Design a protein around this ligand. Structure first.
Ligand SMILES: [Ca+2]
Ligand SMILES: [Ca+2]
Ligand SMILES: [Ca+2]
Ligand SMILES: [Ca+2]
Ligand SMILES: [Ca+2]
Ligand SMILES: [Ca+2]
Ligand SMILES: [Ca+2]
Ligand SMILES: [Ca+2]
Ligand SMILES: [Ca+2]
Ligand SMILES: [Ca+2]
Ligand SMILES: [Ca+2]
Ligand SMILES: [Pt+2]
Ligand SMILES: [Zn+2]
Ligand SMILES: [Zn+2]
Length: 616
């Protein structure tokens, strides 16, 4: 999964990520709530006010409400209730034995000249008996005195801040200078409750993300090393720690994220700075109104240009990346997967296709994940391999080719093929999967798609020209009484079946259980499904399709003109080819994808070509 952390599993890494996000949002106390709501309802016509940038960098005094930055009057209670819902409660100065200042919200402040406006939330998570189990440390970092943010033009201010993070270890030492003493109190409090450093979660966004990286850098040497094994998840940080301890998460198009190399200012800092980084998620796109807009992108992309900061705002972090967490494709992803998150305003959502424009970014590699919203989306996949997820709402999908999985989700969803129904083949396993094969052989596995739209250059069956809507039914694609039949198939059961293809060729759907799929001399498509399936070509140009937790399969009679298709399987890194998954075991080649495997019986690995083994 994209947010895998240390050696935690997929699932435990997700739970950590979701807590980090939650305490991170809490730390801003809904600063951007009204702005985000305005954007959602109206779009980004009016851009972004410099006062929002200065607020994000310098903090606020307080509370409300601030030009032009709409203020949700319930910001405070909303934010507290949200963090509580995620399991967290602010810990009191008294509980920590902390002699210093906390405000009306319970926020802690920085301790040394230059840091005195920095903020941190110290939160506790408790079991059902009221025993503390986890401590959450959410930094809300600030640039220094607020008053400095308007003594020059906002671009000069940003430029100078960036240039000052690296020299004299300013960034590295930030948390030591700001919260050194408080963190000693936290150690004692943790030990008093039987917790160790592994039980502490550290997060934050923006300058708060810079603080996360700082604490990680300091954790080996300060506070007795207590925090060396703590969990660090930083959002939208300009910096990266020198340690291997921080998961730096951010939107590719967020100009703050990764602006510095470690803490070093470079020629890319005020431009596009999308070079890969080991600690960071490098290819998550916020598909928002700015990103989508020709007008907005006339000027070169730069942190110094305030509209670009739209992609830095915290609400879209929490909303968009929570949708990543919830995705049915989540366990297919890895840290540098290309993921496009639908983040359009309501007006833009109506007529803008969410797609990988690859704007202001290095060329993307590997498969592409496009995650929709809970409303009606227009989603367009590319000519490579795509995983498209509609979620709720009536979603419409387009896709440019390749091998793909399209999940309609809730709603009445549509696949728009943009070409004649005559150029495509359709099959259906009876288990909610509708397969769509293009003229070049690319295959889409689709679910919850009720309608197919085709563009007919002639009068399909002498009746319908131009755009034609077909209904997906058990018996075929229907237009009134007209049916486009599915391809010949043989369907099994969820137990162990023997299925035999006819000489003309069949799709063979084993479904669950350990199946015996006997192909014929025709061109068959073998879908063993779950279980450990034995699949015999029987001649012809056959295709063997593997999705999900597909089991330990054996393929017999595989030749050069046959194809393996791995689509929505485990263990695939961007741009893996089959050699990364292949080994020889005696006379057979074995292809492994996480815990699942295909054995190509009596096939020497050196005889295989990548053209015959599609890894998506
Ligand atoms: Ca990376
Ligand atoms: Ca990138
Ligand atoms: Ca595609
Ligand atoms: Ca949707
Ligand atoms: Ca949907
Ligand atoms: Ca079966
Ligand atoms: Ca099976
Ligand atoms: Ca056959
Ligand atoms: Ca065959
Ligand atoms: Ca063959
Ligand atoms: Ca199988
Ligand atoms: Pt398709
Ligand atoms: Zn307990
Ligand atoms: Zn057999």
């Amino acid at each position: 999964g994209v947010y895998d952390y240390k050696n935690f599993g997929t699932a435990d890494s997700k739970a950590l990520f979701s807590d980090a996000m939650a305490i991170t949002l809490y730390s801003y106390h809904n600063l951007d709530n009204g702005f985000a709501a305005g954007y959602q309802h109206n779009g980004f016509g009016l851009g972004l006010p410099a006062t929002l940038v200065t607020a994000l960098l310098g903090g606020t005094d307080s509370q409300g409400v601030i030009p032009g930055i709409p203020w949700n009057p319930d910001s405070e209670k909303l934010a507290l209730d949200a963090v509580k819902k995620a399991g967290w409660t602010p810990i009191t100065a008294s509980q920590l034995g902390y002699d210093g200042k906390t405000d009306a919200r319970g926020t802690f402040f920085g301790e040394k000249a230059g840091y005195t406006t920095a903020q941190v939330e110290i939160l506790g998570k408790y079991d059902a008996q009221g025993h503390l189990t986890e401590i959450g440390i959410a930094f809300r970092g600030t640039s220094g005195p607020r008053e400095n943010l308007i003594l020059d033009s906002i671009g000069d201010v940003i430029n100078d801040l960036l240039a000052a993070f690296g020299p004299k270890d300013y960034a590295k030492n930030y948390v030591g200078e700001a919260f050194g003493n408080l963190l000693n109190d936290v150690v004692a409090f943790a030990k008093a409750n039987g917790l160790s450093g592994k039980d502490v979660l550290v997060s934050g966004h923006s300058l708060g993300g810079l603080a996360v990286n700082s604490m990680a850098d300091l954790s080996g040497g300060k506070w007795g090393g207590f925090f060396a094994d703590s969990n660090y998840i930083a959002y939208a940080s300009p910096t990266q720690s020198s340690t291997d301890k921080v998961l730096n998460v951010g939107y590719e198009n967020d100009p703050v994220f990764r602006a510095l190399d470690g803490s070093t200012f470079t020629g890319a800092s005020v431009g596009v700075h999308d070079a890969p980084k080991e600690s960071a998620t490098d290819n998550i796109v916020s598909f928002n109104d700015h990103y989508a807009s020709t007008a907005w992108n006339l000027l070169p992309f730069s942190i110094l240009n305030i509209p670009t900061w739209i992609s830095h705002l915290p609400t879209a972090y929490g909303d968009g990346m929570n949708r990543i967490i919830e995705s049915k494709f989540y366990d297919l992803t890895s840290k540098d997967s290309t993921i496009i998150v639908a983040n359009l305003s309501d007006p833009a959502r109506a007529n803008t296709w969410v797609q990988d424009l690859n704007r202001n970014a290095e060329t993307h590699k590997g498969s592409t994940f496009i995650i929709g919203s809970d409303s009606n989306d227009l989603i367009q996949g590319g000519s490579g391999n795509d995983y498209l997820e509609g979620r709720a709402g009536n979603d419409t999908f387009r896709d440019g080719g390749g091998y793909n999985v399209i999940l309609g989700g809730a709603g009445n969803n549509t696949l728009d093929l943009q070409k004649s129904v005559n150029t495509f083949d359709f099959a259906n396993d009876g288990a909610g999967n509708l397969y769509v094969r293009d003229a070049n052989g690319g295959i889409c596995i689709t679910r919850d798609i009720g309608s197919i739209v085709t563009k007919e250059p002639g009068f399909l069956w002498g009746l319908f020209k131009d755009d034609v809507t077909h209904s997906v039914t058990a018996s075929g694609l229907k237009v009134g009484s007209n049916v486009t039949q599915y391809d010949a198939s043989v369907k099994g059961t969820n137990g162990a079946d023997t299925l035999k293809a006819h000489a003309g060729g069949d799709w063979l759907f084993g479904l669950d259980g350990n199946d015996h799929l006997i192909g014929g001399v025709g061109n068959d498509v073998f879908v063993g499904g779950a279980g450990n399936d034995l699949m015999e070509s029987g001649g012809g140009a056959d295709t063997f399709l593997f999705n999900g937790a597909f089991g330990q399969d054996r393929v017999v009679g595989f030749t050069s003109n046959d194809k393996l298709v791995f689509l929505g399987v485990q263990g695939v890194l961007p741009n893996d080819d089959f050699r990364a998954h292949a080994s020889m075991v005696g006379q057979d080649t074995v292809l492994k994808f996480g815990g699942d495997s295909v054995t190509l019986v009596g096939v020497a690995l050196n005889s295989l070509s990548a053209d015959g083994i599609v890894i998506a």
